[PDB]
């Protein structure tokens, strides 16, 4: 998953 779609990880 691209960083801007992942709410559970520091991008």
């Amino acid at each position: 998953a691209n960083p801007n779609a992942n709410p559970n990880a520091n991008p």
Partner: antibody, heavy 122, light 109 residues
Framework: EVQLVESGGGLVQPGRSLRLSCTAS????????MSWVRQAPGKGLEWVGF??????????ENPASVKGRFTISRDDSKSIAYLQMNSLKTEDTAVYYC?????????????WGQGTLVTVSS | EIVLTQSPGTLSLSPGERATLSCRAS???????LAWYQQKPGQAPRLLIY???SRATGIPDRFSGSGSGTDFTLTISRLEPEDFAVYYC?????????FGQGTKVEIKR
């Protein structure tokens, strides 16, 4: 028992500002990302953004439809997430749901509030 | 954006019957990133299935999910009166997060 209670909805003119609150209870609110979803009258669901937990940087993501107008914020000491809606458009008329983003690798929207109605009209 | 196309638009069925709902993604979506929600009349949506096949907390066994790539399916094995509702799929692996347009499960007469 997880509970999410939205408030702040109402009737507002286009171009005005309105802040929605989501009071969260029944879980460790500070550990979770939170997300707002909206439903226009007679229409389906549209994601309007999420905010990460503070440990994960506490920043937000929004789709182009509301980017630059809607800001999500959170007060973990009060267990409240916010949706600051600026430059409101008539098309923003919708029920706005606050949702908890599930932890782990599959970040579905595990819990939803009852929703608060925002009617943008001149 | 990934477009989720659900079919059929309306599923007209009786209690006790099996309901099969389809969600087609415009590109491949990891099964980890697909969910299904139920919205009963006048209520907020609730999570049913996450990661394509995992039931959410408190969701009865008659609800199941499967699929991968671009084709995803939600099955209700034996409809109960409370199951007549609108069902939405959702992907959260790509930004923006998107929802299907919804499938209505309507009581048949």
């Amino acid at each position: 028992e997880v509970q999410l209670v939205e408030s702040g909805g109402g009737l507002v003119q286009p171009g005005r500002s309105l802040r929605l609150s989501c009071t969260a209870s029944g879980f460790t609110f500070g550990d979770y990302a939170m997300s707002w979803v909206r439903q226009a009258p007679g229409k389906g669901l549209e994601w309007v953004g999420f905010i990460r937990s503070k440990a994960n940087g506490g920043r937000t993501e929004n789709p182009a439809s509301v980017k630059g107008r809607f800001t999500i914020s959170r007060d973990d000491s009060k267990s409240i997430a916010y949706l600051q809606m600026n430059s409101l458009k008539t098309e923003d008329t919708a029920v706005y749901y606050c949702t908890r983003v599930e932890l782990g690798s599959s970040w579905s929207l595990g819990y939803w509030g009852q929703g608060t109605l925002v009617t943008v009209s001149s | 954006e990934i477009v989720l196309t659900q079919s059929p638009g309306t599923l007209s069925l009786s209690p006790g019957e099996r309901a099969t709902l389809s969600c087609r993604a415009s590109q491949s979506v990891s099964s980890t990133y697909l969910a299904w929600y139920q919205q009963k009349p006048g209520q907020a949506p609730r999570l049913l299935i996450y990661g394509a096949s995992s039931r959410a907390t408190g969701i009865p066994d008659r609800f199941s999910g499967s699929g991968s790539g671009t084709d995803f399916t939600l099955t209700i094995s034996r409809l109960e009166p409370e199951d007549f509702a609108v069902y939405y799929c959702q992907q959260y692996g790509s930004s923006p997060w998107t929802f299907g347009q919804g499938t209505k499960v309507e009581i048949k007469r």
